[PDB]
Write a protein that binds this DNA or RNA. Structure first.
Ligand SMILES: [Mg+2]
Ligand SMILES: [Mg+2]
Ligand SMILES: [Mg+2]
Ligand SMILES: [Mg+2]
Ligand SMILES: [Mg+2]
Ligand SMILES: [Mg+2]
Ligand SMILES: [Mg+2]
Ligand SMILES: [Mg+2]
Ligand SMILES: [Mg+2]
Ligand SMILES: [Mg+2]
Ligand SMILES: [Mg+2]
Ligand SMILES: [Mg+2]
Ligand SMILES: [Mg+2]
Ligand SMILES: [Mg+2]
Ligand SMILES: [Mg+2]
Ligand SMILES: [Mg+2]
Lengths: 141, 104, 68, 187, 141, 227
RNA sequence: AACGAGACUCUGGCAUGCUAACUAGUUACGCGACCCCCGAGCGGUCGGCGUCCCCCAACUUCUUAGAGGGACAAGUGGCGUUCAGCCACCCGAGAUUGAGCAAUAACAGGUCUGUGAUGCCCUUAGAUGUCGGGGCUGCACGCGCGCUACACUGACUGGCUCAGCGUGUGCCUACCCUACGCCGGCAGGCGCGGGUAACCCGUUGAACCCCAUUCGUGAUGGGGAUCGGGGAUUGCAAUUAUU
């Protein structure tokens, strides 16, 4: 019997899809382990959900993540939101309801943007200035 | 016998293009032609940004014109005679209709 | 800010109430459909604004009568 | 700890804000304990949303300044990181308590407004006390390590230490004392 | 272990020694008087740069087939400072990348692909996996 | 070519063709009430349609003019002989086509008439044919050596928003006289023909309209009648 | 009563609901194969990596683009002559995205060097309607918009790892975007293919940023002006240096 669920996360034109499936541990993003994602200064940022729910909740699932878009920092947030959105969706279809609304609150109390993406996008440039709001230098005399 | 045939439509007006494509889908399905639903390719956007004034005086304003090209394709497995039968009827607007005889 | 409705919205809502007084209730998501079916509003934003002023008027007509 | 984030290594419990005014405007512990001073952080949305920000992310944000440092935040987190370890070596106290004491010792509580060179004295709001403290503490580290062989991380720790141990040898405390003296003259 | 499970900066360092431990992989003659790209200012610091770039090219071919010279020279391209005028992106050196791919073929490590390009042989995947395992077991990752 | 032009160039080239044909037929059928072309590329043929007010003048004697027009349109745009096919047609309710009125006023002024008399005549005609409003401007050296402008408005007229891309017809025409050029500008508002084609459908955005039913009776007794 | 404001159009944010896709994918296993034990184990079975190859597999989560939905100051508490409305909060993708369009009246504003728009004046064969050469770039100086810097929050040398909006073979007009092999330190050359394009360049291996070396407060390895000598390409032609 197949048992799996696919979810996604977004942050500034950078999608990250996570596939959760019954297994043992093994949170793997783009084939490489989670401990070796390029910017290791934000290492504690994509570890927060598992450092929050404990190693025991990610003990019956095998999550695989694939990312594409944005930059080196907009993808960390995509991954970190996608794996949470995945564990919360797997717990609400194959487990009880309180068992999912407990981890939902554990996650959404410490930080939003773990379950709800944020809608900030770049703004358009206008003629007469190097950017959206700045204007070129005025010159009387 | 049977042939894999491809119709492609493209136009600058969504309403009439979708109407033509839907009526084609219907008028080909009623004869059990095993149609393959419309495939919406990305919409193309030609853009031209010009100065608003002749003569170069005044505040430096600009105009942004743009044209939009919508494109769809349909795939059928049917004899070519029936394809020419159904594809040459009820083409109201300035939509294109191209037929190719082998694309699969 | 804004959120000040215009005469085109207020007059429409007043007419809608003065004709179909008995079909309108106190919730917004039903008044929306009622005004959608009885009138012809050529937009969806205008429909929501008219249906939202109709509710605010209905909440008052249950008290003392308004003067329009 | 499984439910208490420190900083990786720096525990955020047993840190005391010994002011009654400046607390509720310094977000150190018990709800704002986080692993890194780096969040998305739509904190510049409404008027007072800024006081809910962790203080280490209020310093990380302010430290990247003067042109060729704007947006370079992953460079500005490693600075605070390398500085906290220098602080823990030179003193031995929890490096967050040194930061809190430095923020307290360097925000002016009287200041003066130009009015009608006529100035009139006024008292500083707590949020402006925190903001001025952070700005003053960052400018000292900036100006101290501009053409020295010392690094921006040694001088930030020097500043924090000389500020928490009120000494007038730090740029921030010299500046506080001037603003309050100039304001006392115009009293 | 696989090649993707280990820190790549130590993997390149180990593979460079592996290559410069056999005596094979004949280097060009101009190794001491070459700038490595148009956008550089000096010759590489490391005297034995050719083995490091061969290891890098091999680990890059392990991760995408059919690479060919015109992409190796994009993989090593960076920024050029045109003195007083703004900076731009610039390509690597075709001669260097071509001689590196020809020196790797001289080791049975790579072969010309079926579609035009270069690809690892079965014998090269093995030599990369062995070094990956060696690195993983060394640092006890 | 062995592989034909791309879609972008194809559509741009179609637009340039239509613009050049419209310019050509504007410069010629002015005295015959030319009011627009409709290129309808039909199976096996390229058909062009010319709406006008005086169709006999368009085709002429046995159709000499229309055949000359087919000839030139086939010579200049490089069509294979026998492809270009041209038709004339009469426009209904000519008072609502701005170009027709603009050219009519241009020739009525080129023939000698008090400019106010001419403008008021065309205003009368345009408003009588059924139209929410009109506006006619004439700019130039009217009665003197210093230029001026004279505007004659009537009825309702909108200037702003999206509803102006429809619901209005605009025409700008130059008219050269013994001393310099005059500029004619005509604007007309189309009167919302529902399901018809004298104006547009899709009424104005700020036009909410309410219907009123009846047949509800208050006298009621709980009777259940059967069938 | 009319115009302008608003309404209106495009755009950004949300749909695990609908429509449906080898010119987009996912998962599954049919697979088959490579590789390493990296796990129990043996190395096999189970697994782990794959932009390695297939499916007339199942599907639309990610991609595409159409139709609808959805936000209304609607709910709750204060302040309001209890009216129009304002502040705060719950729920929420969101409680104040960004542009386009825009009135009456006017200016001796700019444009006769955009026009086969144009009045009058001038010239019209010793032309004010064509070819060769020079100029528009000349340098005591005054001014405007800008690029690069004044370094250690740095420069250099290696390694690693992420985009989006576009354009692409030309009718007169003759030129487009490039893969991959070879040759050359480099600019560049030769040879063979794809693309009129969600099909090929392209999974657009972008820069800053990230990780390690050398430098050490010295106008220094910061900065890159000015100038000498050499090599290529475009073109009918490069000197007053085209790049
Ligand atoms: Mg910018
Ligand atoms: Mg209006
Ligand atoms: Mg408007
Ligand atoms: Mg009134
Ligand atoms: Mg209220
Ligand atoms: Mg909420
Ligand atoms: Mg707006
Ligand atoms: Mg105006
Ligand atoms: Mg002009
Ligand atoms: Mg003139
Ligand atoms: Mg000019
Ligand atoms: Mg000539
Ligand atoms: Mg000449
Ligand atoms: Mg000049
Ligand atoms: Mg200017
Ligand atoms: Mg570098």
């Amino acid at each position: 019997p197949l048992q799996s669920v696919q979810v996604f996360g977004r942050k500034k034109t950078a999608t990250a899809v996570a596939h959760c499936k019954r297994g043992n541990g093994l949170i793997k993003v783009n084939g490489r382990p989670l401990e070796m994602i390029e910017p290791r200064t934000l290492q504690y940022k994509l570890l927060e959900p598992v450092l929050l729910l404990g190693k025991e909740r990610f003990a019956g699932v095998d999550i695989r993540v694939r990312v594409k878009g944005g930059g080196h920092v907009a993808q960390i947030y995509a991954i970190r939101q996608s794996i949470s959105k995945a564990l919360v969706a797997y717990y609400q279809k194959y487990v009880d309801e309180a068992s999912k609304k407990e981890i939902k609150d554990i996650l959404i109390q410490y930080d939003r943007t773990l379950l709800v993406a944020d809608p900030r996008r770049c703004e358009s440039k206008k003629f007469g200035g190097p950017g959206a709001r700045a204007r070129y230098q005025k010159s009387y005399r | 016998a049977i042939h894999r045939i491809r119709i492609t439509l493209t136009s600058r007006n969504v309403k009439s293009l979708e109407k033509v494509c839907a009526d084609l889908i219907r008028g080909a399905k009623e004869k059990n032609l095993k149609v393959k639903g419309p495939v919406r390719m990305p919409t193309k956007t030609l853009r031209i940004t010009t100065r608003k004034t002749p003569c170069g005086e005044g505040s430096k304003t600009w105009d942004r014109f743009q044209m939009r090209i919508h494109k769809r394709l349909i795939d059928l497995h049917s004899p070519s005679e029936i394809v020419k039968q159904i594809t040459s009827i009820s083409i109201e607007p300035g939509v294109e209709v191209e037929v190719t005889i082998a694309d699969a | 800010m804004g959120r000040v409705r215009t005469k085109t919205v207020k007059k429409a809502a007043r007419v809608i109430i003065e004709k179909y007084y008995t079909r309108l209730g106190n919730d917004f998501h039903t008044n929306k459909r009622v005004c959608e079916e009885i009138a012809i509003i050529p937009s969806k934003k205008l429909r929501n604004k008219i249906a939202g002023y109709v509710t605010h008027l209905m909440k008052r007509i249950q008290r003392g009568p308004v003067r329009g | 700890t499984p439910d208490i984030k420190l900083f990786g290594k720096w525990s955020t419990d047993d840190v005391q804000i010994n002011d009654i005014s400046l607390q509720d405007y310094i977000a150190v512990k018990e709800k704002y304990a986080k692993y890194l001073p780096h969040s998305a952080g739509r904190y510049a949305a409404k008027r007072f949303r800024k006081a809910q920000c962790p203080i280490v992310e209020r310093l990380t944000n302010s430290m990247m300044m003067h042109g060729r440092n704007n947006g370079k935040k992953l460079m500005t987190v490693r600075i605070v990181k390398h500085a906290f370890e220098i602080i823990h070596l030179l003193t031995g106290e929890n490096p967050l308590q040194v930061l809190v004491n430095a923020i307290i010792n360097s925000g002016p509580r009287e200041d003066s407004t130009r009015i009608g060179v006529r100035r009139q004295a006024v008292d500083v709001s707590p949020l402006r006390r925190v903001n001025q403290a952070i700005w003053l503490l960052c400018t000292g580290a900036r100006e101290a390590a501009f053409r020295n062989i010392k690094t921006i991380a040694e001088c930030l720790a020097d500043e924090l230490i000389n500020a928490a141990k009120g000494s007038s040898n730090s740029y921030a405390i010299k500046k506080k004392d001037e603003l309050e003296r100039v304001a006392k003259s115009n009293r | 272990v696989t090649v993707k499970d280990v820190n790549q900066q130590e993997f390149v360092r180990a593979l460079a020694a592996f290559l410069k431990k056999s005596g094979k992989l004949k280097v060009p003659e101009w190794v001491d008087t070459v700038k490595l790209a148009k956008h550089k200012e000096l010759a590489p610091y490391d005297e034995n740069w050719f083995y490091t770039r061969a290891a890098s090219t091999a680990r890059h071919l392990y991760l995408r087939g059919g690479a060919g010279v015109g992409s190796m020279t994009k993989i090593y391209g960076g920024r050029q400072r045109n003195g007083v005028m703004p900076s731009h992106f610039s390509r690597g050196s075709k001669s260097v990348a071509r001689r590196v791919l020809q020196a790797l073929e001289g080791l049975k490590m790579v072969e010309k692909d079926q579609d035009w390009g270069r690809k690892l042989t079965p014998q090269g995947q093995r030599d990369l996996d062995r070094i990956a395992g060696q690195v993983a077991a060394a640092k006890k990752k | 070519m062995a592989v034909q032009i791309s879609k972008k160039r194809k559509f741009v080239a179609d637009g340039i063709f239509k613009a050049e044909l419209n310019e050509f037929l504007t410069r010629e059928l002015a005295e015959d009430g030319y009011s627009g072309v409709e290129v309808r590329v039909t199976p096996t043929r390229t058909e062009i349609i010319i709406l006008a007010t005086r169709t006999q003048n368009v085709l002429g004697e046995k159709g000499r003019r229309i055949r000359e027009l087919t000839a030139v349109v086939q010579k200049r745009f490089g069509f294979p002989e026998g492809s270009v096919e041209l038709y004339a047609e009469k426009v209904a309710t000519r008072g609502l086509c701005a170009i027709a009125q603009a050219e009519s006023l241009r020739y009525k002024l080129l023939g000698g008439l008090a400019v106010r008399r001419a403008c008021y005549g065309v205003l009368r005609f345009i408003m009588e044919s059924g139209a929410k409003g009109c506006e006619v401007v004439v700019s130039g050296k009217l009665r003197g050596q210093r230029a001026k402008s004279m505007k004659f408005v009537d009825g309702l007229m909108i200037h702003s928003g999206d509803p102006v891309n429809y619901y209005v017809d605009t025409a700008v025409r130059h008219v050269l006289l013994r001393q310099g050029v005059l500029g004619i500008k005509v604007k007309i508002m189309l009167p919302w023909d529902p399901s018809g084609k004298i104006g547009p459908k899709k009424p104005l955005p700020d036009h909410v309209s309410i219907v009123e039913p009846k047949d509800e009776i208050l006298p009621t007794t709980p009777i259940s009648e059967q069938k």
